[PDB]
Amino acid sequence: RRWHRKINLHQKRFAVVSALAASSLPALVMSRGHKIENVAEVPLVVEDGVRAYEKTKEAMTFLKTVGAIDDVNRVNDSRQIRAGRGKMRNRRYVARRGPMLVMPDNK
Amino acid sequence: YSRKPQVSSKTAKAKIADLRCHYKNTFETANVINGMKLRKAQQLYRQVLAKTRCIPFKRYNGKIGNTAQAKEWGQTKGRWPRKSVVAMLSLLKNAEANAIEKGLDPGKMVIKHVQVDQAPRVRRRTFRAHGRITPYMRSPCHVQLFMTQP
RNA sequence: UAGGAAGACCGAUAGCGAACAAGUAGCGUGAGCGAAAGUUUGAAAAGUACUUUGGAAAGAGAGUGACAUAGAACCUGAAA
RNA sequence: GGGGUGCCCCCACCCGUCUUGAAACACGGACCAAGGAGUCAAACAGACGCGCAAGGGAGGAGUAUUGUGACAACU
RNA sequence: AAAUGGAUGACGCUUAAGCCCCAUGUGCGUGAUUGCCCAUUAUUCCUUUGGUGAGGGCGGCUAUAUGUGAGAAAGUGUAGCCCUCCCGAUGUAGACGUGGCGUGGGGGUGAGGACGAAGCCGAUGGCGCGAGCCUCGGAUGGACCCGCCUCUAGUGCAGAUCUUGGUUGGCGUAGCAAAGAUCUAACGGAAUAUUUUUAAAUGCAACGUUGGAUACUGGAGCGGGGAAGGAUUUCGUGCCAACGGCACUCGUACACGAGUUGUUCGGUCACUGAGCACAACGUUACACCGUUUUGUUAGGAAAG
RNA sequence: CAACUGCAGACCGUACUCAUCACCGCAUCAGGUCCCCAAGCAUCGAAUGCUCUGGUACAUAGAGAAAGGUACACUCAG
RNA sequence: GUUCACCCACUGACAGGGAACGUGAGCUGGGUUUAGACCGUCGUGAGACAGGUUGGUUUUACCCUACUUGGCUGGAGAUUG
RNA sequence: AACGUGUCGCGAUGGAUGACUUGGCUUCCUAUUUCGUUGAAGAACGCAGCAAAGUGCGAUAAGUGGUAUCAAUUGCAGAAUCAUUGCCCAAUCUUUGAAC
Ligand SMILES: [Mg+2]
Ligand SMILES: [Mg+2]
Ligand SMILES: [Mg+2]
Ligand SMILES: [Mg+2]
Ligand SMILES: [Mg+2]
Ligand SMILES: [Mg+2]
Ligand SMILES: [Mg+2]
Ligand SMILES: [Mg+2]
Ligand SMILES: [Mg+2]
Ligand SMILES: [Mg+2]
Ligand SMILES: [Mg+2]
Ligand SMILES: [Mg+2]
Ligand SMILES: [Mg+2]
Ligand SMILES: [Mg+2]
Ligand SMILES: [Mg+2]
Ligand SMILES: [Mg+2]
Ligand SMILES: [Mg+2]
Ligand SMILES: [Mg+2]
Ligand SMILES: [Mg+2]
Ligand SMILES: [Mg+2]
Ligand SMILES: [Mg+2]
Ligand SMILES: [Mg+2]
Ligand code: NA
Ligand code: NA
Ligand code: NA
Ligand code: NA
């Protein structure tokens, strides 16, 4: 059976560009389900000292400072056991999608 | 039990499961004593054994014989089922023993709620012409009753 | 032969014939053919001592357990 | 107002099928539960959606990566 | 002039309820132009649905707290953005449409659950033209599950002399009729001599052993021993759930224990027969082929 | 070499059945299945009938003059 | 084998038809019409012939109705007012 | 009158549905990777205190030996680093079978 698909290279780059622009409008961000009431200046840009953190405690303080902890709490409270046969097939829990953090590399 | 006694402190109950008697015969034998007294029901069973009276067959009468002794019950068909009468006599004796334990007087009890049901069947086989085999099945029954002192 | 990794798959008439003492029980002189069946009671056997009727099987009480219409092919328990 | 059971006056041939024509003295029809039949691949054509346009698009390979990593990015 | 008794549809009708024609309300040689009954037809009114549809509003300043009020979306399609108006509506084979219904799973989003999830039940009603959806009750259950947007498929049953299970009238019916057959007393057994409402008319029927009686097989035997086949059916003690198409206290049934002893019997040791086919040789793409007792293997040096 | 005497004599089978119930016919099925022994009287007799020995009362039974049946059961004037 | 026909007799007379060419889970099975076999004619042959001849399984009712007998028992608002 | 019919409450018969799943099916990867006359694969018979099948084993027969760990095994018995458990070097390995 035909399991995989081909997509034109230009169309794939068009889709990425459109999704990036959609993330810049707070009305579309709230409508998808994210909690951004305490954020300032969407799109949010933070300094580069973040890459030097070594402890998870430091990371959690940074998320609270910029107001991104509400979206993290939304994912935490939504964790639950999946309905149906899927829980027998190695996908037992479901959770929602939270914030993104984009980095210049894998460092 | 399908039904509940009105006064539980003056009632004696008894039941038997998977009794090895024909269900259709026991259905008629047990049904006739509903509403009777305990002593009157025992007397009728003794006279049926002596073949002086008969048990009326009202629902499973099929094509069975006619007799003069069925006129007492207002019909024409009846029989004298030996195995079912003996089994029903044992059940009444157990119910009478239960009443003695509770302190009641067996001479005043009146029978209420006789019920006969079909039990799981038992399978045998018989041999027919041209190399065929057909079922030869047995039909047991469940019986339950109680009786109250007025 | 030893290990590993998985799945937008099937879910006990499905998926291998076989989730079970299954290439077993059984069938055929033979070459060969070939099933049904979840022990899924309960968290724990705590699996009903004892009284009474009965030859026994069992019935009527008593008792364990949150539930015994959860009593042993014992979750739920449809239709004819 | 809805629901259940009975009654009265009126109306009312047995379902599915082949066939010009079935209520048929045409065939299949005891009852219930669970199963049960236009799918996947490959070549071509037309309609409709999307990208680019005298150009469009690759494939195979390769470059960089326990990380949503058999994905995604790049040539 | 014909074959079951029988058809103006039946009864019946003769100052017709028959045949051929003519009329019509209240008042038939004085009201000129509708005596009356019955349609999925015509006119008219209300509602739905679809259009080669036709028009209109949509730049919200009139004024207003509680103890005349709600809406208004620039729109194919929805609980249709709203208000007027016009025209069509049945249909086998067949084509197409639907912000049409329902089922298992993936990506998202939002909830529910031991103060009770799924499943199951219903004189539980409400909503929708409908496929269906939702609430209610359970004197049901005891651990998971759904709304919406999208992606995906082993996605919807009344019939195929359909497949697999279960249930069913017929039905306590058809039958259980070859081989002649049993009776009596005592004992055994829970299977009796069972009555509280004189004795018979209220515990029937049936089982084994022993004695007695009667009878059958009739030596080509329901006698006593073996082969083939079977493989513990043999024996003692116990036992009656299921099985011996009725019965059982009996049993080739079930349970627990026991039993088969050879220098001479049968077989091998230890013979040849109808025959078979190792070795050797030959053939075959390939031995899994052929020859191999008419005194006898092998182009053949087979004697230890 | 003929007598006598002393010692030792290996292995496997061995129960039960062989049939109107132990085998083959889906079964305790009126079918089928090889061999040996074989009494008295009648009589030509291994025909057929009855009997001592041995063996069996096991094959669902009880009550009981309907029609119509089956029978290895009969009789009928002219 | 017949339906039909034709003879012998009796008689008042020995008319003609229908009922799924009445009637096979009522019978019988002579005919017709499988497989065996013989003859004649036809065919190169296997075979053929509405030509002759002989031998050749006749299954099931216990259901509904109809009919024949046999019994039990309601009912006047034909079960109620 | 009974039989028969219909509706509701309760009880039988039967084993569907739901929720569970140490099973199947499909795809991918890694090795000091491939049996036997030094008698294989298969086939038979045996072995436990109580042991029918299955599992393990072979008259050293639910196991002997080495190694790491340490207090269990369990239905009832019974014994008290040495068992059990995992792994593996040294051994035993009945009758057959290419079978010689
Ligand atoms: Mg028979
Ligand atoms: Mg047979
Ligand atoms: Mg299976
Ligand atoms: Mg299978
Ligand atoms: Mg035609
Ligand atoms: Mg039709
Ligand atoms: Mg007709
Ligand atoms: Mg239409
Ligand atoms: Mg699926
Ligand atoms: Mg169905
Ligand atoms: Mg009878
Ligand atoms: Mg004799
Ligand atoms: Mg003999
Ligand atoms: Mg019996
Ligand atoms: Mg013999
Ligand atoms: Mg026999
Ligand atoms: Mg003489
Ligand atoms: Mg003689
Ligand atoms: Mg003789
Ligand atoms: Mg005569
Ligand atoms: Mg006829
Ligand atoms: Mg010629
Ligand atoms: Na579900
Ligand atoms: Na046809
Ligand atoms: Na008329
Ligand atoms: Na020879």
Side-chain angles (χ1 to χ4, degrees):
Chain A
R1 178 203 306 249
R2 214 159 62 97
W3 302 99
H4 308 84
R5 296 293 189 271
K6 331 175 37 193
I7 317 158
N8 287 358
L9 178 66
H10 186 260
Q11 275 185 303
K12 289 192 303 208
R13 305 188 168 153
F14 203 168
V16 159
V17 147
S18 276
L20 255 193
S23 97
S24 183
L25 306 170
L28 301 192
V29 175
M30 303 191 5
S31 164
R32 215 202 65 101
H34 293 279
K35 312 205 99 221
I36 54 141
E37 289 88 36
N38 284 308
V39 193
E41 253 271 16
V42 161
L44 187 61
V45 183
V46 306
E47 72 192 327
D48 278 296
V50 152
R51 328 232 309 286
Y53 288 167
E54 270 133 6
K55 306 283 300 178
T56 310
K57 169 166 307 173
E58 254 179 318
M60 294 299 289
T61 301
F62 152 77
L63 289 180
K64 169 186 58 204
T65 299
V66 297
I69 208 61
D70 311 5
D71 226 330
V72 184
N73 286 337
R74 159 183 97 97
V75 177
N76 257 274
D77 300 8
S78 61
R79 190 181 148 96
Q80 75 193 2
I81 287 177
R82 157 188 316 245
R85 183 83 70 228
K87 70 168 91 70
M88 267 171 227
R89 315 214 173 142
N90 301 329
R91 26 189 207 267
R92 189 155 189 96
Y93 292 88
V94 285
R96 284 164 202 177
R97 295 291 181 189
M100 271 225 189
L101 187 47
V102 187
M103 291 260 196
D105 41 40
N106 316 103
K107 242 64 156 63
Chain B
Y1 294 86
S2 319
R3 264 145 51 76
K4 261 200 24 165
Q6 334 186 356
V7 184
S8 92
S9 60
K10 322 202 84 44
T11 310
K13 330 214 280 213
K15 78 198 217 198
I16 174 82
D18 286 286
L19 180 76
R20 247 211 168 196
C21 297
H22 279 179
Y23 155 73
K24 291 202 224 226
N25 291 346
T26 320
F27 171 84
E28 325 269 11
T29 305
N31 269 352
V32 71
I33 68 167
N34 200 344
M36 254 173 168
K37 299 215 218 62
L38 177 66
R39 298 297 186 216
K40 285 324 199 174
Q42 284 166 325
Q43 174 201 323
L44 160 72
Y45 283 149
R46 281 193 305 256
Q47 301 193 261
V48 169
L49 279 180
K51 273 182 127 276
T52 285
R53 299 165 79 185
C54 90
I55 297 281
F57 277 36
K58 275 160 138 218
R59 176 165 307 171
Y60 302 108
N61 27 46
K63 325 182 208 123
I64 66 168
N66 313 293
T67 171
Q69 319 191 353
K71 288 196 288 242
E72 150 189 29
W73 314 108
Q75 66 160 61
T76 279
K77 312 215 236 186
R79 261 177 186 183
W80 305 264
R82 215 206 38 89
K83 256 182 102 170
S84 307
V85 166
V86 161
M88 288 305 299
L89 273 167
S90 296
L91 196 55
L92 283 186
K93 253 175 279 153
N94 184 244
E96 181 190 346
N98 295 336
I100 301 273
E101 287 157 25
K102 303 182 76 165
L104 313 163
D105 183 19
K108 324 231 195 168
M109 314 291 276
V110 190
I111 290 165
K112 292 140 180 334
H113 177 61
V114 182
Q115 186 181 303
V116 179
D117 311 83
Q118 315 197 40
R121 303 211 173 96
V122 198
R123 172 176 272 288
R124 287 195 283 175
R125 85 208 152 139
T126 178
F127 304 94
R128 321 295 311 249
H130 305 279
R132 282 212 314 159
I133 304 190
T134 48
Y136 214 69
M137 320 270 321
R138 183 170 257 124
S139 313
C141 51
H142 309 310
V143 193
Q144 57 173 241
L145 61 97
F146 60 76
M147 56 209 209
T148 323
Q149 180 187 287

